[PDB]
Amino acid sequence: KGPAVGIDLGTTYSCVGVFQHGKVEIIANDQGNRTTPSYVAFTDTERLIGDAAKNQVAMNPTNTVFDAKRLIGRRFDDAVVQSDMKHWPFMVVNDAGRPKVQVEYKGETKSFYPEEVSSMVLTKMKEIAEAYLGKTVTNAVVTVPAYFNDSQRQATKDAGTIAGLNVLRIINEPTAAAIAYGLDKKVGAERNVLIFDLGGGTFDVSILTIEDGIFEVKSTAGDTHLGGEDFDNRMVNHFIAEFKRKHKKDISENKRAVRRLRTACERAKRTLSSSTQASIEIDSLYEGIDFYTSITRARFEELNADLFRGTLDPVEKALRDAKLDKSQIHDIVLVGGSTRIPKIQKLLQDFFNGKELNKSINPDEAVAYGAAVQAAILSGDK
Ligand SMILES: [Cl-]
Numbered sequence: 001k002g003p004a005v006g007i008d009l010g011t012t013y014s015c016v017g018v019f020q021h022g023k024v025e026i027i028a029n030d031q032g033n034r035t036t037p038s039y040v041a042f043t044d045t046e047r048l049i050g051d052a053a054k055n056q057v058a059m060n061p062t063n064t065v066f067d068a069k070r071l072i073g074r075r076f077d078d079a080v081v082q083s084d085m086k087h088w089p090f091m092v093v094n095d096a097g098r099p100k101v102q103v104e105y106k107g108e109t110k111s112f113y114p115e116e117v118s119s120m121v122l123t124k125m126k127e128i129a130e131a132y133l134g135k136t137v138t139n140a141v142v143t144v145p146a147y148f149n150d151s152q153r154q155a156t157k158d159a160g161t162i163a164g165l166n167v168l169r170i171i172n173e174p175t176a177a178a179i180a181y182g183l184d185k186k187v188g189a190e191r192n193v194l195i196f197d198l199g200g201g202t203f204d205v206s207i208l209t210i211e212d213g214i215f216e217v218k219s220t221a222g223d224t225h226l227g228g229e230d231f232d233n234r235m236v237n238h239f240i241a242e243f244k245r246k247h248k249k250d251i252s253e254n255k256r257a258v259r260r261l262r263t264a265c266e267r268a269k270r271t272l273s274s275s276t277q278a279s280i281e282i283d284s285l286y287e288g289i290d291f292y293t294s295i296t297r298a299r300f301e302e303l304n305a306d307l308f309r310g311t312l313d314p315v316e317k318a319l320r321d322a323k324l325d326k327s328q329i330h331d332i333v334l335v336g337g338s339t340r341i342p343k344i345q346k347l348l349q350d351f352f353n354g355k356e357l358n359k360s361i362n363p364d365e366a367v368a369y370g371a372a373v374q375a376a377i378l379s380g381d382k
Pocket residue numbers: 010011012013199200201
């Protein structure tokens with residue numbers, strides 16, 4: 001048993017960390033990326049996992065699988081499954097009451113339970129950890145949403161087992177983020193912690209109470225279908241209209257063109273969290289026509305103004321459910337790359353009358369960070 005690792009198995013991307021020599025190290029994958037898309041794809045000749053999968057989605061949409069976390073621990077008949085499957089290009093089928101994703105792989109029809117798909121992502125995370133450490137990785141803490149039920153938790157454990165991991169503990173994502181910031185190292189009176197978690201595809205607000213290192217989930221709120229991708233999409237539509245003006249062509253039905261634009265918009269979003277201008281640079285976007293343009297932070301904000309303001313409604317609901325006034329929150333913790341958005345941070349701070357945010361740990365890494373901390377404690381290394 002080498003060091004144990006912490007794995008954030010995310011809806012759209014995943015992240016693995018390890019506690020070593022008094023520090024957490026977030027581990028870059030085989031593409032040099034500190035997060036890995038929760039994607040798997042199948043071609044005539046192979047199975048792709050992570051960046052390779054994500055990067056060929058437009059070329060191979062029916063055999064590229066994502067959002068397995070939406071299915072994990074579910075039954076086919078579930079209202080969530082029935083609704084969600086309407087917006088996936090891959091097939092979901094009923095196996096005796098349990099959903100399976102069905103794809104073509106090497107010209108053959110194959111199908112996989114959600115935890116089998118997730119097991120492939122966990123295998124990727126294990127492998128990148130092993131490549132970094134230069135030794136075997138067996139023990140892990142794996143995180144899940146606080147709202148996950150017993151079935152969802154057990155299926156997640158099953159994904160780990162399938163990947164050859166000994167899952168030391170299933171830990172809640174907000175709890176992991178709080179552990180990252182050492183909020184359970186505070187000694188004294190009860191403390192109320194709000195986690196504001198805006199991922200690629202979901203938005204979670206959680207309120208925890210911590211006392212003597214002991215966590216209680218007081219309330220959860222959010223929107224399981226709101227995330228950074230929504231903000232990217234607003235930019236995408238903006239640029240489709242721009243291309244139409246400038247080049248008198250509508251790229252809307254070309255999946256490859258839209259995908260390359262989407263990728264550019266995602267990059268632009270990140271850029272705009274640190275600078276006031278970002279470029280869109282796409283050689284041969286459509287019919288050989290180049291698209292080189294740019295956008296300001298202000299314009300990005302305007303395009304998304306309603307969605308940004310809308311993030312405070314779940315914050316209000318969570319406080320209501322927890323029977324807490326906004327003034328009773330001791331700590332606000334930011335999780336998810338979109339929480340880097342200055343306008344979001346400003347909206348949140350303004351809501352909390354100027355209170356400062358816990359944001360020094362990369363918000364896309366905070367969950368894996370806390371998972372890594374707890375893995376080291378549980379394995380007897382911290
Ligand atoms: Cl995600």
